[PDB]
């Protein structure tokens, strides 16, 4: 099988990467960073997201694995001392594949599309943020605030969590929308609660006055000018994970927020 | 088709009920309150929940319809002035059926089972509330607080909403757990975020010291003594709704919280 | 100086109490549990609150000291290994006094008054909770929910904190009101935010339908029937603390919630 | 008395301004926009804040009055139809003065000072926001998130409110700090609760890595580069309000968020 390794670029990660490559040479496994089937990320969650966006054109051909040399390592399944055992099990093909939903963002002018593994958010180019929120072509609310966040299931432990969103098991094919500091008074009104949307629903944001927005997708943040629409839907594409040990989502959540 | 009507018992509701019965007599529709196929509720959401728990043994044989003479009327599809048109459309059979998920609660001693349309909650019999939260047999957290709430999708606009939970579209077969005033300090720790569980997962609450709990199911509240386990799962049973007009969940939410 | 010691009644606390009494005998200090000037509490925060309510008639004649053999120990200034040094410093009179504000609750029928060191809360006798909230004789809101909490400054780290309230430095002579799961929809509306009231303001709760309420004051909880009014104001009375080492409130907060 | 009027610049406001000037000519009142004693603002709250920052060097020489031709008008005491009666009462000197606390922000490099009527906030220049929070020279927490907000009492109905802060009566000489989307996980920890600081306390923010910050003061937002410290304290200076009718803060709050 062809494989690649992405390193956080610190010393431990580079060297762990050199050892694993050397380990893989002992199994006739071709390192190919153009068309791999297995992508290993050595670092934290930012390094893993970078690895994901490097290969966003080949998502179904690839299965990902993270190694935790970072701080939190939510998407990681392995600590550095397991790295040698990873090489072995991965070479003999003893793993099963797990798929998590992804988020499609579309931006139109007067079209760009993006895939997010954690979330996509929207803020103004500076100055007040005001958008209308249209759900399946019904006008739902006019949002005044700092911004909005739309999150995948596995993204709900991330920025979504800090905004009061719910944590969502990734077997549920959904996306979740949360507010950033909404204004609510006599004249302005938002739902307040996060909203959880099923696979077949479309949430569109439409400008009211200013048409420039700071749009983010995972760690990337781009300015879009003269925007007509930002459309959110659950993607048809999925990320595949290589699992060698049963490591349930809720245990992952527990270890990351409660203890160990 | 056999049918029954439940009234809030105020004057408008009783009289609207008398008129509809008289209307139904003109179509050879048998009023039967033992084995109806259609149950009409005239009142608010409490009246509708009562109607639901009256027939919890016959859920798949029945389709429900609510008429709003109450205050909020979330589960209502009709205002009183449409009542005459309801009789007609229902008699000629021009409706489609919509199904929403339900919540199964099981309580064990040393077993009682209940079905909830909004939610089931747990509090202490007075004195401190402390439980361990076990998800799919993995121990997730020890909860110290006032109580916990587990909510259906259509229940998320209800008590769940007031506790900071997310609103959840009812096409998603899930249940959602939210905290009531959790204690978080140097020594005590909860997740904080609401949790959204898929159909196949089991959440069990297990006592730590006191074993008496105030358990609620929709409007009903019962004391249980010497409790060993409270087990939550998404039910295999569903509630069926008779729909004559397309009335999407998110429009229902909008009309109930934003305007009109 | 006359003194008393209250023990949590576990083995460590009783024995630490016996040693300190024996230590105090070496200084001609009269143990008097009727009219002490110094009250030492050995246990956690519940033990300290009990000690406070034991002497609520003699608040300005007494200065309190807590010793932490409990779990959190927010009101504690000493760990058990410092107990011997406490005896000494307290006998030679090398301490300064610190005063924190208290909360006055008045309940009227058709009058009972209470002093709270943490907070006083109000819930229904079971069934729905609905009250009007009158501030300085202006009608402010009608509250529908689970209950309300009114907290002293030093109480804001306690139940208030779990309800989203702000932490408040005790040099500020104020009381703070927070909601328990308020209902907010098209027809029902509360402020949502906690409210912070100055010394000279009066907040009165007035029943709407049910007139029986579960009223709490610190760890005590009493049923009141046929209630006409619950009136909250910042008390004229203060609790005095004996301080031997500078131990600022914000450091106390840090040690209790962030680390150490 | 010398006086000036600031207009929102829409048609109603300009014309209401022309009429009031003409009204004031009938009383020998000198319009002076250099050294007035009375500053009238015609518009919404943004127009009023602009009026405040225009005269921040002469705060004790001036008393402010707002006229509501905007949308919310929190700082307004008058609607346009009262404008004629305002001219009269203000000319005959029948008013009393009300003073609200202000917030001092100091920024140091390797000093700029600002006065805020609502709040001052801090965010990064793009990229992650990380600061240490030092209270009275004790290190309290390391904040990771989107930013922080420090608010006056009368500012607590504003941005503070949208971030979950408490509303604070302006007789309390305090400032309140609230988080913008803090990150809390196994490794990162913030207090979460808002913090309310008394007049004599100093809160200093100190950079950890990036030293460029987007700092706001009311409607103004400035980039500061190579920042060493951001220091918050309750100002010695106060804003004076001209009151002709008793209009209590809590009634103002009620009218702005509950109804009318
Ligand atoms: N106010 C906020 O909470 C906020 C603001 C902006 C971005 N973010 C998150 O930061 C992500 C990307 O930034 P970055 O990781 O490259 O730098 P970063 O600023 O260090 O990310 C912040 C933290 O989020 C963690 N994280 C990332 N994905 C997660 C997930 N699915 N579940 C739980 N935690 C997760 C990171 O873990 P590691 O320790 O392994 O790096 C890190 O601890 C965004 O996708 C976004 O979700 C959060
Ligand atoms: N702190 C809280 O928020 C709280 C506490 C206890 C119970 N509840 C809710 O009250 C329900 C049953 O009580 P009740 O209706 O008989 O008396 P209730 O006290 O009047 O119910 C409270 C309000 O919830 C509304 N409601 C019920 N189901 C809803 C839903 N699926 N979505 C949105 N709103 C909904 C009711 O609407 P109507 O105006 O049509 O009656 C009423 O406005 C419980 O199942 C529970 O969800 C809420
Ligand atoms: N949902 C909630 O958060 C909730 C519900 C009811 C009561 N309470 C609190 O419990 C207090 C009395 O109960 P209890 O202590 O006898 O039994 P408790 O149930 O053990 O008290 C709960 C926790 O609050 C802590 N606590 C008490 N006063 C505090 C303060 N000023 N600041 C920070 N933490 C404080 C206690 O500390 P220790 O470990 O030292 O005992 C304990 O960790 C009430 O006054 C009330 O504030 C909280
Ligand atoms: N996410 C947020 O909530 C957020 C973000 C940035 C700024 N702000 C607020 O906006 C203020 C300045 O902006 P702006 O007014 O010029 O434009 P703005 O964006 O229109 O201000 C937002 C709203 O805040 C209201 N407001 C201002 N001061 C208030 C107060 N003391 N109490 C209650 N509401 C108040 C404004 O009232 P009017 O209708 O009369 O204009 C407006 O409704 C800032 O000082 C800041 O407090 C809020
Ligand atoms: Mn990272
Ligand atoms: Mn009801
Ligand atoms: Mn205790
Ligand atoms: Mn404005």
Coordinates of C-alpha atoms in Angstrom, one line a residue, chain A residues 34-199:
Chain A
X34 CA 1.0 12.0 -4.4
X35 CA -1.5 9.1 -4.3
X36 CA -1.3 7.3 -0.9
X37 CA -3.9 5.0 0.5
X38 CA -2.9 5.7 4.1
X39 CA -2.0 9.1 5.6
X40 CA -0.3 9.3 9.0
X41 CA -0.3 12.6 10.9
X42 CA 2.3 13.1 13.7
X43 CA 1.5 16.1 15.9
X44 CA -1.7 17.6 17.3
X45 CA -5.1 18.3 15.8
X46 CA -4.0 21.2 13.7
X47 CA -1.4 18.9 12.0
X48 CA -4.2 16.4 11.4
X49 CA -6.5 19.0 9.8
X50 CA -3.6 20.1 7.6
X51 CA -3.1 16.5 6.6
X52 CA -6.8 16.3 5.8
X53 CA -6.9 19.4 3.6
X54 CA -3.8 18.3 1.7
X55 CA -5.8 15.3 0.3
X56 CA -9.3 16.7 0.1
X57 CA -9.5 15.5 -3.5
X58 CA -8.9 11.8 -2.7
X59 CA -11.0 11.3 0.4
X60 CA -12.5 7.9 -0.4
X61 CA -9.1 6.5 -1.6
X62 CA -7.4 7.2 1.8
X63 CA -7.7 6.2 5.4
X64 CA -6.2 8.5 8.1
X65 CA -4.3 7.8 11.4
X66 CA -3.1 10.3 13.9
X67 CA -0.2 10.0 16.4
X68 CA -0.3 12.3 19.4
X69 CA 2.8 14.4 20.0
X70 CA 0.8 17.5 20.4
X71 CA -1.1 18.9 23.4
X72 CA -4.7 17.7 23.2
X73 CA -4.8 15.3 20.2
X74 CA -8.5 14.7 19.9
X75 CA -8.3 13.0 16.4
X76 CA -5.3 11.0 17.6
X77 CA -5.5 7.2 18.3
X78 CA -1.9 6.6 19.2
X79 CA 0.8 7.8 21.5
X80 CA 4.4 7.9 20.3
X81 CA 5.4 4.7 22.2
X82 CA 2.8 2.7 20.2
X83 CA 4.3 3.9 16.9
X84 CA 6.3 0.6 16.3
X85 CA 3.2 -1.5 16.8
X86 CA 1.3 0.7 14.4
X87 CA 3.8 0.0 11.6
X88 CA 3.3 -3.7 12.1
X89 CA -0.5 -3.9 12.3
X90 CA -0.8 -1.5 9.4
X91 CA 1.5 -3.6 7.2
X92 CA -0.3 -6.8 7.8
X93 CA -3.7 -5.2 7.1
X94 CA -5.4 -5.8 10.4
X95 CA -7.6 -2.7 10.8
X96 CA -11.2 -1.7 10.1
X97 CA -12.4 1.5 8.6
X98 CA -14.6 4.1 10.3
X99 CA -16.3 7.0 8.4
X100 CA -17.3 10.4 9.9
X101 CA -19.6 13.0 8.1
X102 CA -18.2 16.2 6.6
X103 CA -19.6 19.7 6.0
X104 CA -20.0 21.3 2.5
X105 CA -19.7 25.1 2.4
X106 CA -20.6 26.9 -0.8
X107 CA -20.0 30.7 -1.4
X108 CA -21.5 32.5 -4.3
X109 CA -20.6 35.9 -5.9
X110 CA -21.6 38.1 -8.8
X111 CA -19.1 29.8 -6.7
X112 CA -16.4 28.4 -4.3
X113 CA -16.9 25.2 -2.4
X114 CA -15.0 23.8 0.6
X115 CA -15.0 20.7 2.8
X116 CA -14.7 21.0 6.6
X117 CA -13.8 18.3 9.1
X118 CA -14.4 20.5 12.2
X119 CA -16.5 23.5 11.1
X120 CA -17.0 26.5 9.0
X121 CA -17.7 29.9 10.6
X122 CA -18.7 33.4 9.3
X123 CA -17.9 36.8 10.7
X124 CA -17.9 40.3 9.3
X125 CA -14.9 42.0 7.6
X126 CA -14.9 44.3 10.7
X127 CA -18.0 46.3 11.6
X128 CA -21.3 44.8 12.5
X129 CA -22.4 41.3 11.5
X130 CA -26.0 41.0 10.2
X131 CA -27.3 38.1 8.1
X132 CA -30.6 36.5 7.3
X133 CA -30.8 32.8 8.1
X134 CA -32.9 30.9 5.5
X135 CA -33.6 27.2 6.2
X136 CA -34.8 25.1 3.2
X137 CA -35.9 28.4 1.5
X138 CA -38.0 29.5 4.6
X139 CA -36.7 32.6 6.2
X140 CA -35.9 31.7 9.8
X141 CA -34.3 34.6 11.6
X142 CA -32.2 37.7 11.0
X143 CA -28.9 37.2 13.0
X144 CA -27.2 40.2 14.6
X145 CA -24.0 39.3 16.6
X146 CA -20.3 38.5 16.2
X147 CA -20.7 35.5 13.9
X148 CA -22.1 32.0 13.4
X149 CA -20.5 28.5 13.5
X150 CA -21.6 25.4 11.5
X151 CA -20.0 22.2 12.8
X152 CA -19.6 18.5 11.8
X153 CA -20.3 15.8 14.4
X154 CA -16.7 15.3 15.2
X155 CA -16.3 19.0 15.2
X156 CA -18.7 19.5 18.0
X157 CA -15.9 18.9 20.6
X158 CA -14.1 21.9 19.0
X159 CA -15.2 25.5 18.4
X160 CA -18.8 24.5 18.7
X161 CA -18.2 23.3 22.2
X162 CA -16.8 26.6 23.3
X163 CA -19.9 28.4 22.1
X164 CA -22.3 26.2 24.1
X165 CA -23.1 23.7 21.4
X166 CA -24.0 20.1 22.0
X167 CA -21.6 17.2 21.5
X168 CA -22.9 14.9 18.7
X169 CA -22.0 11.3 18.1
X170 CA -20.5 10.9 14.6
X171 CA -22.9 8.1 13.5
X172 CA -25.4 10.9 13.1
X173 CA -25.2 12.5 9.7
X174 CA -25.8 16.1 10.7
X175 CA -24.4 19.6 11.0
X176 CA -24.9 22.0 14.0
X177 CA -25.2 25.8 14.0
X178 CA -24.3 27.9 17.0
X179 CA -24.3 31.7 17.6
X180 CA -21.4 34.0 18.5
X181 CA -22.7 36.6 21.0
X182 CA -26.1 37.3 19.5
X183 CA -27.8 40.5 20.2
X184 CA -31.3 40.0 21.8
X185 CA -33.3 43.0 22.9
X186 CA -36.8 44.5 22.4
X187 CA -36.2 44.9 18.6
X188 CA -33.7 42.1 17.8
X189 CA -34.3 38.4 18.3
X190 CA -32.5 35.1 17.6
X191 CA -33.3 31.5 18.5
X192 CA -30.4 31.3 20.9
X193 CA -30.3 27.5 21.0
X194 CA -28.0 25.6 18.8
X195 CA -29.7 24.0 15.8
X196 CA -29.0 20.4 14.6
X197 CA -29.8 19.9 10.8
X198 CA -30.3 16.5 9.1
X199 CA -28.5 15.3 6.0

